[PDB]
Amino acid sequence: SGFRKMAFPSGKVEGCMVQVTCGTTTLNGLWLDDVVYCPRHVICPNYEDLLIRKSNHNFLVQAGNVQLRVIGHSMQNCVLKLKVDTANPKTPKYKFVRIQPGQTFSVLACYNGSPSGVYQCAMRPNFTIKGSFLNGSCGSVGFNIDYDCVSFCYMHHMELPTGVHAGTDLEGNFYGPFVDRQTAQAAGTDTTITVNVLAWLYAAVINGDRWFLNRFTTTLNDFNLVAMKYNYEPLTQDHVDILGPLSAQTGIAVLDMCASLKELLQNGMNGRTILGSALLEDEFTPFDVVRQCSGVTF
Amino acid sequence: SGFRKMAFPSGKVEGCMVQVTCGTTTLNGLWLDDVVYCPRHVICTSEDMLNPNYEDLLIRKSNHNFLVQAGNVQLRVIGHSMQNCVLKLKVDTANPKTPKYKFVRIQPGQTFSVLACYNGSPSGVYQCAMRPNFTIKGSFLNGSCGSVGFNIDYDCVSFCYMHHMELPTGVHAGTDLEGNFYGPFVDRQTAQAAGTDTTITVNVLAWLYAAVINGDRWFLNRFTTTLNDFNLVAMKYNYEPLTQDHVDILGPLSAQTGIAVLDMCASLKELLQNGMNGRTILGSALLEDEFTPFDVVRQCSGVTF
Ligand SMILES: N#CC1CN(S(=O)(=O)N2Cc3ccc(Cl)cc3[C@H](C(=O)Nc3cncc4ccccc34)C2)C1
Ligand SMILES: N#CC1CN(S(=O)(=O)N2Cc3ccc(Cl)cc3[C@H](C(=O)Nc3cncc4ccccc34)C2)C1
Ligand SMILES: [Cl-]
Ligand SMILES: [Cl-]
Numbered sequence: 001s002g003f004r005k006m007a008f009p010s011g012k013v014e015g016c017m018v019q020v021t022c023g024t025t026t027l028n029g030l031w032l033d034d035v036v037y038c039p040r041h042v043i044c045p046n047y048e049d050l051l052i053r054k055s056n057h058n059f060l061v062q063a064g065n066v067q068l069r070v071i072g073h074s075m076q077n078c079v080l081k082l083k084v085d086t087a088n089p090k091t092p093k094y095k096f097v098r099i100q101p102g103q104t105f106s107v108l109a110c111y112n113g114s115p116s117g118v119y120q121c122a123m124r125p126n127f128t129i130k131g132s133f134l135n136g137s138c139g140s141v142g143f144n145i146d147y148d149c150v151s152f153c154y155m156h157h158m159e160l161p162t163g164v165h166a167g168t169d170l171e172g173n174f175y176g177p178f179v180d181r182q183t184a185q186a187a188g189t190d191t192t193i194t195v196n197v198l199a200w201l202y203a204a205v206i207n208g209d210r211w212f213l214n215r216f217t218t219t220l221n222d223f224n225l226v227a228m229k230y231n232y233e234p235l236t237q238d239h240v241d242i243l244g245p246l247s248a249q250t251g252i253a254v255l256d257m258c259a260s261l262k263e264l265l266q267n268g269m270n271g272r273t274i275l276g277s278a279l280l281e282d283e284f285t286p287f288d289v290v291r292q293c294s295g296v297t298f
Numbered sequence: 299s300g301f302r303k304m305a306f307p308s309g310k311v312e313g314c315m316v317q318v319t320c321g322t323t324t325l326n327g328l329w330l331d332d333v334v335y336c337p338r339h340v341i342c343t344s345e346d347m348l349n350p351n352y353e354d355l356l357i358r359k360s361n362h363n364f365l366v367q368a369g370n371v372q373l374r375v376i377g378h379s380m381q382n383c384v385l386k387l388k389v390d391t392a393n394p395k396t397p398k399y400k401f402v403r404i405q406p407g408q409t410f411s412v413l414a415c416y417n418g419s420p421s422g423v424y425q426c427a428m429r430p431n432f433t434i435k436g437s438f439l440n441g442s443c444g445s446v447g448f449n450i451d452y453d454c455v456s457f458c459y460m461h462h463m464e465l466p467t468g469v470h471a472g473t474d475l476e477g478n479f480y481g482p483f484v485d486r487q488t489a490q491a492a493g494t495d496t497t498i499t500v501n502v503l504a505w506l507y508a509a510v511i512n513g514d515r516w517f518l519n520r521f522t523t524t525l526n527d528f529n530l531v532a533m534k535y536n537y538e539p540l541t542q543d544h545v546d547i548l549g550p551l552s553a554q555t556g557i558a559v560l561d562m563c564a565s566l567k568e569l570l571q572n573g574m575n576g577r578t579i580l581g582s583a584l585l586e587d588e589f590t591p592f593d594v595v596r597q598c599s600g601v602t603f
Contacts, residue, residue: 001468002437006422009413011309108307117304117597118423130581132302134599163299163512207468276435278583295439297419 003203003275005283006292007106007120008145015090018068019113020082020139021060028110028139029061029082030152030170032091036061036068036082037170038139039157040075041180051075062113063088077172078157078180096170097144097151101125102193102233104285105142105153109133122196122283123154125233126188127176128164131156142167145298160187192232193282195239198257200281202246203289204274211272213252216259223258230265242286301508301580303588304597305411306450308423313395316373317418318387318444319365326415326444327366327387328457328475330396334366334373334387335475336444337462338380339485347487356380367418368393382477383462383485401475402449402456406430407498407538409590410447410458414438426459427501427588430538431493432481433469434459447472465492497537498587500544503562505586507551508594509579513603516577518557521564528563535570547591555602 020029020038029038042059043050054073059082061068072083099105104122108115109132121129121142133140133156142154157167157180164187166178178185201212224234235258243254261280269278284292318327318336321343327336339347341355359378364387366373377388404410409427413420414437426434426447438445438461447459462472462485469492471483483490506517529539540563548559566585574583589597 001464002435002470004424004426004435004437005303006414006424006437007305009309009312009420009423010307011312011420014307014309109304115307115309118307119302119304121302130300130302132300132304132597134299159299165300273584276584279578292422292437293439295414295416295421295441297416297421 001207003207003292005120006288007118008143009298010106010108010115010118012092012145012150013108013141013143014115015092016088017108017110017113017115019062021062022054022058026112026136028113028137030139030141030155031061031063031068031084031088032094034084034087036070036084037155038080038082039155039168039180040078040080040172041138041157042080045181047075051080075172078168078174079155079170079172092150093148094150094152097153098169098171098173099123099153101127102196102285103153104283104288105144107131107140107142107154107156109137109140111136120283122193122285123175124164124190125193126190127178128160128166128187128190129154131165133159133165141170147298160185162187189231192230192280194227194232194235194261195242196282196285197232197261197280198235198239198243198254199246199286199289200275200284201257201260202243202250202252202286203284203293205250205252206289206293207275209274212260212264212274214260214263216263217253217256218259218262220255220258223255223262226262226265232265246286246289299512299599299603301512301597303425304593305423305425306448308411308413308420310397310450310455311413311446311448312420313397314393315413315415315418315420317367319367320359320363324417325441326418328444328446328460329366329368329373329389329393330399332389332392334389335460336385336387337460337473337485338383338385338477339443339462340385350486352380356385380477383473383479384460384475384477397455398453399455399457402458403474403476403478404428404458406432407501407590408458409588409593410449412436412447412459412461413445414442415445416441425588427498428459428480429469429495430498431495432483433465433471433492433495436461436470438464438470446475465490467492494536497535497585499532499537499540499566500547501587501590502537502566502585503540503544503548503559504551504591504594505580505589506562506565507548507555507557508589508598510555510557511594511598511602512580514579517569517579518561518565519568521568522558522561523564523567525560525563528560528567531567531570537570551591551594554600
């Protein structure tokens with residue numbers, strides 16, 4: 001029993017974190033084999049012009065108490081790839097994957113190449129993340145672990161004026177319409193991840209919280225008309241299919257659970273809580289609910 | 299900016315997790331140097347749990363009855379002893395991944411990270427608090443026994459909790475790493491229930507100071523309160539009494555924000571009376587009590603917004 005915002009164990013990622021310094025800027029880098037990946041704003045804009053003025057020895061890379069020697073450099077989108085002479089002996093099995101809004105991942109927050117904390121978060125529909133980052137956190141990475149393979153999906157680049165965060169995949173492509181420069185940038189109006197709220201309602205049922213269940217059902221179209229009114233993302237047939245296993249385990253049809261959600265949106269919780277929360281939680285995917293209510297190990 | 303329930307990076311603890319099997323029971327163990335620590339109930343057979351005589355069950359065991367697996371490698375047990383509710387298995391290999399560590403016993407209100415494991419393999423990491431009733435609101439399934447709680451201040455891992463059991467309300471009970479249980483609990487299947495839980499007042503205050511640091515003051519008021527008047531009100535909402543020690547501990551956060559502890563107490567008193575009226579504080583519609591004053595200082599900026 002119990003339901004917590006759980007992150008993947010961060011060990012395999014901790015062994016990849018390094019400090020990257022260029023001039024007066026210090027941030028975090030990800031050392032995999034003989035390459036260190038970090039945000040290109042460490043050279044700071046005309047990034048080709050700023051980069052051509054740099055030599056290998058201008059980049060100081062520190063792994064623990066050991067200096068790594070930079071022997072090459074190149075830029076890929078908004079990521080700087082620093083070739084080093086030493087391959088990371090702690091390099092785990094890994095992939096670079098680009099995630100979609102609604103997907104969750106673990107963030108290992110680092111400062112000066114040293115990990116300070118791990119937390120779980122979701123890629124919002126507006127492509128920002130509600131993270132916890134201070135100055136110096138740039139280069140901190142997001143990941144998921146499947147068996148023994150680490151799938152790196154996020155690299156932290158910046159904080160927006162509302163306190164939320166923006167970054168790239170590990171190939172340097174931004175999530176969202178953001179740019180790596182000090183210009184007028186703002187997060188778009190966010191929405192609630194509907195398929196995730198439904199997954200969390202199924203987790204509440206699995207843990208014994210059933211007060212919100214009702215005898216009613218709904219069509220997908222009627223549910224989507226109500227979802228649009230409350231700034232909830234549209235629920236698709238793919239979402240209904242993905243929720244299939246949780247529907248079978250609890251005996252509550254997806255559209256039957258949609259009718260419970262509709263009543264919660266139209267009437268509130270009325271002094272009650274669900275899994276110790278007075279808000280409808282949307283940062284647990286259907287897979288996160290299955291994994292936490294089954295004890296999958298890595 | 300931002301405020302999340304943040305756990306410590308679990309790497310140093312992952313390298314210590316092993317699987318311990320005795321007969322038909324399999325659970326997790328903590329391998330530090332040449333000793334594996336695990337709950338002593340690994341030697342019980344379910345029926346034993348009603349009234350187990352651990353000394354009697356243990357005397358019938360030899361070293362080779364305990365199977366310890368570290369990854370894909372079997373460790374050889376060369377000695378065993380019981381210390382309170384923990385079994386200490388001496389092994390022939392010292393853990394080369396043993397971090398710098400201490401065993402610390404914590405007080406209610408203190409927070410820690412939990413590395414939840416099954417079959418000696420870590421599955422997830424989350425942040426917890428020792429409730430005032432000595433239970434923890436964890437997320438544990440069958441096979442999680444032996445999972446540990448810890449803090450990593452600086453480069454030293456301080457182990458403070460080992461998971462032993464789930465109570466009928468879904469909450470969890472366990473011991474420090476010397477095998478002493480937190481709370482009036484026993485490692486026996488007896489009628490045992492968690493006492494009435496209360497809200498950790500000093501932690502809610504710390505979290506209100508974190509909200510002010512991050513730029514929110516809507517909940518503040520022009521009033522102050524005495525410590526005694528605050529406690530008379532707080533006790534009516536099932537909040538733990540606030541002591542002079544708590545007021546002293548909140549000193550640094552009071553100086554950083556310019557808001558006296560008893561002025562923050564007056565704000566809390568009003569929040570308990572009025573609720574939030576559609577508003578949130580740090581993305582929460584409830585008053586959060588699982589961040590200590592230390593956690594707020596650790597995570598938040600030194601400059602107030
Ligand atoms: N809005 C807003 C804030 C962030 N700015 S800034 O001027 O410090 N800033 C401009 C900038 C522009 C482009 C890029 Cl790619 C990076 C960056 C940097 C960046 O955002 N860093 C950070 C990242 N995360 C958490 C931070 C917390 C606190 C301060 C910086 C933080 C620096 C004011
Ligand atoms: N209440 C209640 C539940 C737990 N029981 S039990 O019979 O499985 N159980 C009695 C028992 C008694 C004393 C001691 Cl020390 C250990 C234990 C064990 C224990 O609690 N295991 C677990 C531990 N954690 C999370 C669990 C989740 C799900 C099932 C077991 C879980 C076994 C029913
Ligand atoms: Cl010791
Ligand atoms: Cl303590």
